[PDB]
């Protein structure tokens, strides 16, 4: 065999400890470049001008940040959506000042994470599996595309993307509330129902299986040694759990088919996260949540406040205080 | 009203910075992660026990064999992610431990919030920021938002206090 | 502000940048404020004021026609912002103007459709490969491929 | 920055004490059989 086919056999080899594949050919250099640049920038990057008003923000540990406050701060507002690679700056000092590392990290990461999803189909095709595991991973992937790419596109600047830091994330959540009222949007509400129910259904499925484990052990050893890897028989009684959970509610409110059950376990959080991912994407074009401000008035015309108006006072507090120097005109249109 | 409760804890308690809510966040989202990835792993490692394209009916509750291959699913995740489960009993218990432990930690978090024992500030950050007017972090920017939340919603959210705030004392940025 | 006698060309903003006019990162004179991110915009109501080095300050002081002032005020008060129940303005605005931009409908409605169709690609492409290969219904117990492979470790 | 003076030894013992507790259990387990 010649060399090109020997290389193709190694890339798609099902015997590597870590599968490479053709999607992995792109994922490895892009994920490494984004990882190496992130760890360095999180430790020693100088302050960068996030809002383009010559007001640099510190983000690295060596400049007075802890794990909770540290972040890689997005690119300057004067850059907007312009492509800002290293070779466009007159020096690395200007590159570090204008938030260069942020664009380099999110671009190599998004391209790498997309290939991570395609790498999930590839190995499943080589092993004889069903291919839809990567479809489940598309929901957290689409969540990354929204707060890193789609929302900057709609607003017109990467400075409004989510920062790469713990405290920086909380900043992205509060400002997004004041400008889009995300809590009152039915897509974030579906996303909350996806993660709450996801945690509910995770604890439910885990408790019911563990509760109907068939006995293979004594008490002086763990119950996990009753199941051993590769055995053909099922390690828990599926019928004992159905009649248990059936009588807790009613019989037909419980799954007797395991395949139908595990399909439900995958469909609820994925479809819920798909919506909240699109909630961020649709709000990138400023189709915000439900506005019921001053929606109830009495017979004379006085405004009878509701809980929606109390929310509006909290949003106005975040509105007037966020980016306290980047506004010279009464309306914040982006 | 629950949404107001969410914003009240951010403005007055800075509940997002509390490390106990962070552990509770990991439990809920970590629980949603395991719920999605376990259901997708089972549905994509099934055995062919029927002949119809909709594989739901190739399973009998009476059956003694496992409906999906634990061996194949283990090798898939070992090569994709690095590690993988290899024992069903430990897997399903882990699916109980993660979301339950998360919620218990968040319960401890707000028990301290009943006594206003908040995780509101970093002392070292505040002391040098008070004497260095050019020291700005994402953490100091959030506290300015909380100072806006408190001053703008208090007279309406707490009418019993009879809060009267003139226009000239309301903290506001430029133009807005 | 210029009608009231303000020299917009020399007006200094609180951040040090020009209150009304600043420079793009490549030198072009542009508008100040957060709209510095939108200096790539081109529009018929705006181009008559732009010269070789960007917005011409002396064209600004002398060549602003009343139809440009009306078009600017019209487009200012019709920004593509609005609630889902069609209340124009930012999220903090009160009920009055019943409006949402047709650009906001068409952009959001076609991103939701574009996303789900990519999911449709991932679904219908992965299955077509499995169906053509023969294992679209699951693993054959008598011929499991993983069992015929060496151990990873 | 003016941090807590004992945050160093508090973090050092937060890691060291439960780590060697698990190391002690694992090494004695592998040494059985």
């Amino acid at each position: 065999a010649n060399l090109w086919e020997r290389f193709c056999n190694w890339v798609t080899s099902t015997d590597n400890r870590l599968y490479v594949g053709w999607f992995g050919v792109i994922m490895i250099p892009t994920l490494l470049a984004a990882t190496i640049c992130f760890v360095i920038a999180f430790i020693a990057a100088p302050p960068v001008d996030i809002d383009g008003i010559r007001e640099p923000v510190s983000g690295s540990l060596l400049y007075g940040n802890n794990i909770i406050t540290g972040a890689v701060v997005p690119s300057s507002n004067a850059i907007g959506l312009h492509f800002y690679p290293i070779w466009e700056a007159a020096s690395l000092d200007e590159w570090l000042y204008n938030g260069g590392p942020y664009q380099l990290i999110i671009f190599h990461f998004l391209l790498g994470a997309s290939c991570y999803m395609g790498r999930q189909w590839e190995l499943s095709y080589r092993l004889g599996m069903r291919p839809w595991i990567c479809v489940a991973y598309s929901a957290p992937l689409a969540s990354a595309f929204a707060v890193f790419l789609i929302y900057p596109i709609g607003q017109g600047s990467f400075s409004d993307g989510m920062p790469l830091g713990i405290s920086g994330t909380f900043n992205f959540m509060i400002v997004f509330q004041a400008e889009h009222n995300i809590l009152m949007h039915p897509f974030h509400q579906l996303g909350v129902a996806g993660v709450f129910g996801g945690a509910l259904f995770c604890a439910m499925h885990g408790s019911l299986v563990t509760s109907s484990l068939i006995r293979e052990t004594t008490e002086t050893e763990s119950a996990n040694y009753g199941y051993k890897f590769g055995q053909e028989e099922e390690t828990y009684n599926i019928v004992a759990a159905h009649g248990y959970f059936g009588r807790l509610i009613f019989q037909y409110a419980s799954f007797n088919n395991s395949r139908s059950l595990h399909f439900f376990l995958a469909a609820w959080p994925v479809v819920g996260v798909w919506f909240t991912a699109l909630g961020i994407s649709t709000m990138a074009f400023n189709l915000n949540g439900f506005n019921f401000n001053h929606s109830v008035i009495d017979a004379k015309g006085n405004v009878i406040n509701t809980w929606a108006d109390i929310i509006n006072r909290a949003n106005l507090g975040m509105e007037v205080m966020h980016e306290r120097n980047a506004h010279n005109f009464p309306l914040d249109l982006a | 009203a629950i949404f107001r409760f969410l914003l009240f804890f951010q403005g007055f308690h800075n509940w997002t910075l509390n490390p106990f809510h962070m552990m509770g966040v990991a439990g809920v989202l970590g629980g949603a992660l395991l719920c999605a990835i376990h259901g997708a792993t089972v549905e994509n490692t099934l055995f062919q026990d029927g002949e119809g394209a909709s594989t739901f009916r190739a399973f009998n509750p009476t059956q003694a064999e496992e409906t999906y291959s634990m061996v194949t699913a283990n090798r898939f995740w070992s090569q994709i992610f690095g590690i993988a489960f290899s024992n069903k009993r430990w897997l399903h218990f882990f699916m109980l431990f993660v979301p339950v432990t998360g919620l218990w930690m968040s319960a401890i978090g707000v028990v301290g919030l009943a006594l206003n024992l908040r995780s509101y500030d970093f002392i070292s950050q505040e002391i040098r920021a008070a004497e260095d007017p050019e020291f700005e972090t994402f953490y100091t920017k959030n506290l300015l938002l909380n100072e806006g939340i408190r001053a703008w919603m208090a007279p309406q959210d707490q009418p019993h206090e009879n809060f009267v705030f003139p226009e000239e004392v309301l903290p506001r940025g430029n133009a807005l | 502000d210029q009608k009231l006698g303000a020299n917009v060309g020399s007006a200094q903003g609180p951040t040090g940048l020009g209150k009304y006019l600043m420079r793009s990162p490549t030198g072009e004179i542009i508008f100040g404020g957060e709209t510095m991110r939108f200096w790539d915009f081109r529009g018929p109501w705006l181009e008559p004021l732009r010269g070789p080095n960007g917005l011409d300050l002396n064209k600004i002081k002398n060549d602003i026609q009343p139809w440009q002032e009306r078009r600017a005020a019209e487009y200012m008060t019709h920004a593509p912002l609005g609630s889902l129940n069609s209340v124009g303005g930012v999220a903090t605005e009160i009920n009055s103007v019943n409006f949402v931009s047709p650009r906001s409908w068409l952009a959001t409605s076609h991103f939701v459709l574009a996303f789900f169709f990519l999911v449709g690609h991932l679904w219908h492409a992965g299955r077509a490969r499995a169906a053509a290969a023969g294992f679209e219904k699951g693993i054959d117990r008598e011929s499991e491929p993983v069992l015929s492979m060496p151990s990873l470790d | 920055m003016e941090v807590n003076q004992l945050g160093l030894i508090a973090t050092a013992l937060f890691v060291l004490v439960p780590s060697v507790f698990l190391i002690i259990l694992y090494v004695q387990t592998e040494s059985q059989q």
Binding site: I67 | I83 | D153 | -
Partner: peptide
């Protein structure tokens, strides 16, 4: 001291990744 403390803890976690992946307890079929 803080930065060295944080970087040290982070380095140990990355070091734990290498051992948990390549020196794991080998999956075994009976």
């Amino acid at each position: 001291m803080e930065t060295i403390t944080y970087v040290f803890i982070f380095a140990c976690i990355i070091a734990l990744f290498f051992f948990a992946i390549f020196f794991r307890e080998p999956p075994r079929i009976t």
